[PDB]
Amino acid sequence: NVEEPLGAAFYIAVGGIASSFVIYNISRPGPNGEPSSLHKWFSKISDYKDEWETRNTLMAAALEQAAHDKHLLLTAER
Amino acid sequence: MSLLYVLLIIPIIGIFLISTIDSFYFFNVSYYKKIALITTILNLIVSLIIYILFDFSNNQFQFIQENLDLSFYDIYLGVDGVSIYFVLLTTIIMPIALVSNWNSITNNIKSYLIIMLLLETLLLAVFLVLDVLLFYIFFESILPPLFILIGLFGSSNKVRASFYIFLYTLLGSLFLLLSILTMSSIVGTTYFDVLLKSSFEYTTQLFLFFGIFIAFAVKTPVWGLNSWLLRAHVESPLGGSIVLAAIVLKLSLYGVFRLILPILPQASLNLTYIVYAIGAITVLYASFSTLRTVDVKELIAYSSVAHAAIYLMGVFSNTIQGLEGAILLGLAHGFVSSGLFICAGGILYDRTGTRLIYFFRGLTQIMPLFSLFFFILCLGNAGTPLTLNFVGEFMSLYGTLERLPIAGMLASTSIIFSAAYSIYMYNRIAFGGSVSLYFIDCFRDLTKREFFILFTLVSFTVILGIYPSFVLDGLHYNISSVVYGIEPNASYLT
Amino acid sequence: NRVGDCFLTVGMFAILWSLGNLDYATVFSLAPYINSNVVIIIGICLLIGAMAKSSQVGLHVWLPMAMEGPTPVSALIHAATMVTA
Amino acid sequence: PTPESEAFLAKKPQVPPTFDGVDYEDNKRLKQAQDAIIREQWVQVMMGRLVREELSKCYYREGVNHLEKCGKLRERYLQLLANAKVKGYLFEQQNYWSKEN
Amino acid sequence: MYLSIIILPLLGSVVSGFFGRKVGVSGAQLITCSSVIITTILSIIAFFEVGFNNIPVTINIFRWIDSEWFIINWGFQYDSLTVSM
Amino acid sequence: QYDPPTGWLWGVRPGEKYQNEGWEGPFFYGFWGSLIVFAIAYAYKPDTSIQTWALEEARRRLEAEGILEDPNPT
Amino acid sequence: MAGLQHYKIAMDPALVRLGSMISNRYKYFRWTKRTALVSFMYVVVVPSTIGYLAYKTDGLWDLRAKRRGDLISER
Amino acid sequence: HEIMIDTEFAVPVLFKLLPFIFTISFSVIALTLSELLSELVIYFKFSRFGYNIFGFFNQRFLIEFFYNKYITNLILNLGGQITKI
Amino acid sequence: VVKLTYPDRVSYPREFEGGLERELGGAGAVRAFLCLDDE
Amino acid sequence: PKDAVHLGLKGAAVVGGIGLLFAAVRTSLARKNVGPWAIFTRNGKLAATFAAVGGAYDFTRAAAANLREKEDWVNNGIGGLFAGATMGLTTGRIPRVLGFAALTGVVLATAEYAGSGLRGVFKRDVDEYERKEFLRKNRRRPIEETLAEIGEGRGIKPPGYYERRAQRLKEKYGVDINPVCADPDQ
Amino acid sequence: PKIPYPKHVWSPAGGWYAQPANWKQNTAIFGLVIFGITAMVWKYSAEHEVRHKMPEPDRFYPSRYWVKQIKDYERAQKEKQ
Numbered sequence A: 001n002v003e004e005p006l007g008a009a010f011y012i013a014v015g016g017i018a019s020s021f022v023i024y025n026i027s028r029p030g031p032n033g034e035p036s037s038l039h040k041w042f043s044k045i046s047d048y049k050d051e052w053e054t055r056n057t058l059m060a061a062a063l064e065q066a067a068h069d070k071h072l073l074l075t076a077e078r
Numbered sequence B: 001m002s003l004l005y006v007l008l009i010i011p012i013i014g015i016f017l018i019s020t021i022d023s024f025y026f027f028n029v030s031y032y033k034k035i036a037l038i039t040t041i042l043n044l045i046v047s048l049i050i051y052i053l054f055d056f057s058n059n060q061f062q063f064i065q066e067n068l069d070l071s072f073y074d075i076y077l078g079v080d081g082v083s084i085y086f087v088l089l090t091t092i093i094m095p096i097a098l099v100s101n102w103n104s105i106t107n108n109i110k111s112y113l114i115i116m117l118l119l120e121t122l123l124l125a126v127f128l129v130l131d132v133l134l135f136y137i138f139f140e141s142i143l144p145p146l147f148i149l150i151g152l153f154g155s156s157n158k159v160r161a162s163f164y165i166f167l168y169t170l171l172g173s174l175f176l177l178l179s180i181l182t183m184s185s186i187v188g189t190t191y192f193d194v195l196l197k198s199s200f201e202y203t204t205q206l207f208l209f210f211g212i213f214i215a216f217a218v219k220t221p222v223w224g225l226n227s228w229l230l231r232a233h234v235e236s237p238l239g240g241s242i243v244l245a246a247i248v249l250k251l252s253l254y255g256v257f258r259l260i261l262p263i264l265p266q267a268s269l270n271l272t273y274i275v276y277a278i279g280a281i282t283v284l285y286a287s288f289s290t291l292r293t294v295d296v297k298e299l300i301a302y303s304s305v306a307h308a309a310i311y312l313m314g315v316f317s318n319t320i321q322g323l324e325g326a327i328l329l330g331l332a333h334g335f336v337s338s339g340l341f342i343c344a345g346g347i348l349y350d351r352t353g354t355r356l357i358y359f360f361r362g363l364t365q366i367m368p369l370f371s372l373f374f375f376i377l378c379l380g381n382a383g384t385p386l387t388l389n390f391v392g393e394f395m396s397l398y399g400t401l402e403r404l405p406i407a408g409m410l411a412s413t414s415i416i417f418s419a420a421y422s423i424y425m426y427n428r429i430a431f432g433g434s435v436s437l438y439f440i441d442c443f444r445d446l447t448k449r450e451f452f453i454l455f456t457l458v459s460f461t462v463i464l465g466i467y468p469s470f471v472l473d474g475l476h477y478n479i480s481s482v483v484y485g486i487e488p489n490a491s492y493l494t
Numbered sequence C: 001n002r003v004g005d006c007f008l009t010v011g012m013f014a015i016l017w018s019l020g021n022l023d024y025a026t027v028f029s030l031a032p033y034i035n036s037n038v039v040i041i042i043g044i045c046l047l048i049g050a051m052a053k054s055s056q057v058g059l060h061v062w063l064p065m066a067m068e069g070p071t072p073v074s075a076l077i078h079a080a081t082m083v084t085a
Numbered sequence D: 001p002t003p004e005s006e007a008f009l010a011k012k013p014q015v016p017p018t019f020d021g022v023d024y025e026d027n028k029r030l031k032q033a034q035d036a037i038i039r040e041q042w043v044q045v046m047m048g049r050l051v052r053e054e055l056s057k058c059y060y061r062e063g064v065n066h067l068e069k070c071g072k073l074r075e076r077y078l079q080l081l082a083n084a085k086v087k088g089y090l091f092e093q094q095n096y097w098s099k100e101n
Numbered sequence E: 001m002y003l004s005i006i007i008l009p010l011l012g013s014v015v016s017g018f019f020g021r022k023v024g025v026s027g028a029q030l031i032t033c034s035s036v037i038i039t040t041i042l043s044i045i046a047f048f049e050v051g052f053n054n055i056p057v058t059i060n061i062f063r064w065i066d067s068e069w070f071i072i073n074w075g076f077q078y079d080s081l082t083v084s085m
Numbered sequence F: 001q002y003d004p005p006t007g008w009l010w011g012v013r014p015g016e017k018y019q020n021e022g023w024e025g026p027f028f029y030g031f032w033g034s035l036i037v038f039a040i041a042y043a044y045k046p047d048t049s050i051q052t053w054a055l056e057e058a059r060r061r062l063e064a065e066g067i068l069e070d071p072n073p074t
Numbered sequence G: 001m002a003g004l005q006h007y008k009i010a011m012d013p014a015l016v017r018l019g020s021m022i023s024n025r026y027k028y029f030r031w032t033k034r035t036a037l038v039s040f041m042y043v044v045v046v047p048s049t050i051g052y053l054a055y056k057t058d059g060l061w062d063l064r065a066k067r068r069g070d071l072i073s074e075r
Numbered sequence H: 001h002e003i004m005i006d007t008e009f010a011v012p013v014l015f016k017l018l019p020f021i022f023t024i025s026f027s028v029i030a031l032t033l034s035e036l037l038s039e040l041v042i043y044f045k046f047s048r049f050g051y052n053i054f055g056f057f058n059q060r061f062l063i064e065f066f067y068n069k070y071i072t073n074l075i076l077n078l079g080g081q082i083t084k085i
Numbered sequence I: 001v002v003k004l005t006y007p008d009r010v011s012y013p014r015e016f017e018g019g020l021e022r023e024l025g026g027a028g029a030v031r032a033f034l035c036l037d038d039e
Numbered sequence J: 001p002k003d004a005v006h007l008g009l010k011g012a013a014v015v016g017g018i019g020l021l022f023a024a025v026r027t028s029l030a031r032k033n034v035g036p037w038a039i040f041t042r043n044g045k046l047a048a049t050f051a052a053v054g055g056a057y058d059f060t061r062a063a064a065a066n067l068r069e070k071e072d073w074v075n076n077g078i079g080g081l082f083a084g085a086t087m088g089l090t091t092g093r094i095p096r097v098l099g100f101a102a103l104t105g106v107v108l109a110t111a112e113y114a115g116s117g118l119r120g121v122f123k124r125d126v127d128e129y130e131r132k133e134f135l136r137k138n139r140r141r142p143i144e145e146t147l148a149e150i151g152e153g154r155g156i157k158p159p160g161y162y163e164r165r166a167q168r169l170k171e172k173y174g175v176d177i178n179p180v181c182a183d184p185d186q
Numbered sequence K: 001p002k003i004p005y006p007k008h009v010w011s012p013a014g015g016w017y018a019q020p021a022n023w024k025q026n027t028a029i030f031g032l033v034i035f036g037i038t039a040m041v042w043k044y045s046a047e048h049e050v051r052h053k054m055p056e057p058d059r060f061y062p063s064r065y066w067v068k069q070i071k072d073y074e075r076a077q078k079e080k081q
Ligand SMILES: CCCCCCCCCCCCCCCCCC(=O)OC[C@H](COP(=O)([O-])OCC[N+](C)(C)C)OC(=O)CCCCCCCCCCCCCCCCC
Pocket: B364, B365, B366, B367, B368, B369, B371, B372, B375, B376, B379, B380, B384, B385, B386, B387, B462, E013, E014, E016, E017, E018, E020, K009, K011, K012, K013, K014, K015, K016
């Protein structure tokens, strides 16, 4: 006469499928290929139009010159 | 402050809190383990944030910080696609490894947590440093904590295991260091964006390859240089084993993508047949000995050797799919070996106190939840499709075949033999009769803790086995940069 | 069956190597033109895989031993559908 | 032609895909060249992927008749398959070649 | 319908297996047999659509493995052989 | 005749309830919560894959040849 | 016996003794004609054979886009 | 590779009905050998020729014997050597 | 025994106008029998 | 050319002389009143073993140069390989014969290949700034220079690869390469 | 008879002779869930299927009643003369 409840795993599976359907639908770009309100935020925050290249170039040249100086000091004539 | 420095700083903060909170509150050890776990969660949250901002098709290192204060040894941090997934693997594995030892560490709990937190910082720094000598410094830094971790928390043979892993790794690494120092002398630095533009002459490349290869074959490990792993991965505490097989084996693989492919292309291509003979021999020999291994944790440890042979052959394939498959297999091995070590070193071992296969049989009858996850993990170890293990094995094996067909054909035999030892070990433990008559007490099934570390690991392998694009899409552009060769009508355009 | 799976994998590897991918339309559209020795390598490879799943004399021994399962399994899996793969 | 998207232009190479007349001490210019060689190889590769897609549709459209009606795509895909491959920039960065040799 | 043939036997299997305690013996048999019989009717309908009218059906959902030249999709083709099998 | 479904989930005997070891909060809410949030965040992440950029140029070049029809002819 | 209390196991002394012999067997290896021959075969001969075959067939074949009127051989 | 025209028209009628002649006769031969004779097969079985024939076919050409001896046990002994020596 | 006694082919090979050459893929592919050497 | 026997005798003398010195120290350090003639009675084998090894070393290296008509590092390897075998011959165990041979052969060959600074080094006597400068920015080389050492194939197909392979394939298999066309209309 | 077994073993598939008293109610919910997922899969299929020949008007082709590709063709073909 014991009854077996559906259980928490039922709601995770059913809820996860339902949530996946809902989240996928609201995240679509819409009828036109126009980014949504949230799409523009993620594109804006991770912009780095030239930041990595600028910093990387400055560091590469500096360690280039530093190697130059050590080569000069290490190969100096006795 | 860079997000990459935050990644290295959070675990040090947790170490500080663990070591000082006795002065603000006998504090319960639950509080200590709560601090360490939340520390790993925040480190994982930061790595997820980095990945959301990360760009998949940039050949500039991302999230770097300008120094402008040059010294003799400065830590420069940067990330690209060939390192971003190893950072994610380290930050996902570390919380699971902490929960897997929540109850089994009974003495010296503060020391255990501080070592694991320090291991997190050091292993992460290996993936993020932008200098070749910085790579050696972080690669070798993990040895003293690993020596102490094994010796304070290991099983009966912990002393011999601790010595083996320390002396093997040191010996191999000393040959890598001599290779790195030669590079540093010719070029003037080991910063990546400078050394990768250098062109070493062919004979220099050959002797540079030897010395870097000796170290990476000790760390892969290749068969015959692998007794340190068969000791250390078994005698280690469970959290140590997960870290040692999920992240520490991956160091030699990520090391190939920084230290051999861009700067030793001619030596790598000319020596691939030596690499492939060793990798082929390792695939067969390790497979046959895994079939005859009677320690359950040693059997899972030996299968790591066979899988690492395939990613090593994929990394020397000089093809896009072989290189991406190598990274895919490395990652898939991290989830699967973590789960199989939890099943053996954490579920069987805690319940029985023994690791001998002769005492186990028919566990499915009383432990259905364990047998369900254990079986799925054993299919992952056999590279069954729908796991990320099939995707990595297939792509790695295809690249090895296309580079050198006889080596790929022998390496392909792993599809037969990995199934053999995985299915044999599963059948003897979960199936193979009624419940073993050596068990006096009955056994409880998985606790909620055991269930949710296995479920989480099994979730990652299956989700990525169905949509491996979640890693490949961020791999394609950067991994193009390590391929060596030309097409006749595609090259030298004008 | 895993022995036959290993040969099917190498045959897929040979298709990928020669044709660039393994969708049916591509393979079947290019088959008349590919090197005849390549067709043999792929063909023999997928024949050996077929031998194991359809229990031909080389790789047959599993199917008689598969009668150890419950009877409706033999009718469905080992007689009518999977043996025909 | 399909208009070049805003996202596409953000990653379009400003330099030709070559290493000739590139000062390797100029970090920015060298990485720009490397990006151009890499991107050009992928375009040729993605071209083959699109040809294969068209060949797939005609095969399932012409059925029995595919051996006669799909030859033009058939030839195109084989040409791309014989020529397009992501080979990296690093051989061409380290090895200069001349036509007059 | 063409996708519904693929997923319906899988759906019944996960209810029978991962929620057997919920449906019991009779619930498991009702769900699996129902989910296989309904799939069989759709297969008979498919055999008429694809085979008798000679209309093959292509369906691609999401890519599985995408590396340079290899693009493998979660994709299904129904042709005369498919519905015959 | 059938039996009532029995068994102790997580080994909790029918009299008692599950006791928290202290890991459940951080693991379910921090570890799994963050992964779920990241997955939602990943739906809105812009595509920066080399394929997407290269497919668009490949389409234009095959539009240039007599392979693909041009939506915007001249 | 090892940290946490585990369940009661009928630890069979023969099986335990067999497990101890396997852990300590390295201490009793000796060079004999048999062991040297086996060790030389597994470590030298078979690997050098695969190495020689891999060497001699390196670059021999390529399958990519090979049609009728062409050869798989490259060398 | 077409043969169907020759199969329909070029095959002599004797070879077309030969299976049915054999089927309708060995069924008589088999049904008569039992329930009517029943000692002849016994005489064959208890001959050394028949005994060996009976055992060979009952033991499935001895393939499982030779597979187990020289493939499966060969691999297990290779692993034994690798682990021990 | 079969090799000694197996009947000769009892029909001339079927011929195809043009050898179905275009519909079998052109001269690059394999074609059908067309006024070729006898067999 | 060189005299293997004459050079080997000198080798035995130099290291036998050192062995005789170590023989004298053992005799001097003896506790019992054995005498001055203990040099060849008790410790005599030590001096003989040393003369045997260094003689064997100088003989076999000198012979190795004569047989190969070359003067390179290898000869110091076989010389050490033979000297190490002679060292192990005294023990009477075959594994010690091989292992001692291997160590002596490897150590002595490694020293000769790298030119150990035990007595001097290969002085460059050149501009070290120019040496490191040239190796540092030799970023791009002529392609032929690479091809001369890795070759063609294995993914290295420089422009004109197909024409050469066509030529190569004809010279070996006697087959002209004419790939078929996939387009019936050509 | 029926085999004895431990009552402490919890298995997701039920165990040994497992049938809850409420099995019909639970089966009804799960069957409803199965219908709901199947319908979503049906909707996806009817929109994303691809054909290269359409069925003739007089032939039994029930997909013509839900598949977007054929529904558009039939609606457009009705505009004749
Ligand atoms: C490949 C990795 C896994 C990916 C797929 C993940 C699962 C997807 C859903 C699979 C179908 C649903 C399976 C239901 C589980 C079976 C019944 C059950 O609950 O077992 C518990 C049962 C409980 O059985 P019980 O309910 O009869 O309880 C009494 C029985 N004893 C005595 C044991 C307690 O445990 C077992 O008895 C068997 C243990 C092994 C379980 C086998 C795993 C089943 C899933 C196979 C995965 C299929 C992979 C596909 C291949 C990949 C494709 C290339």
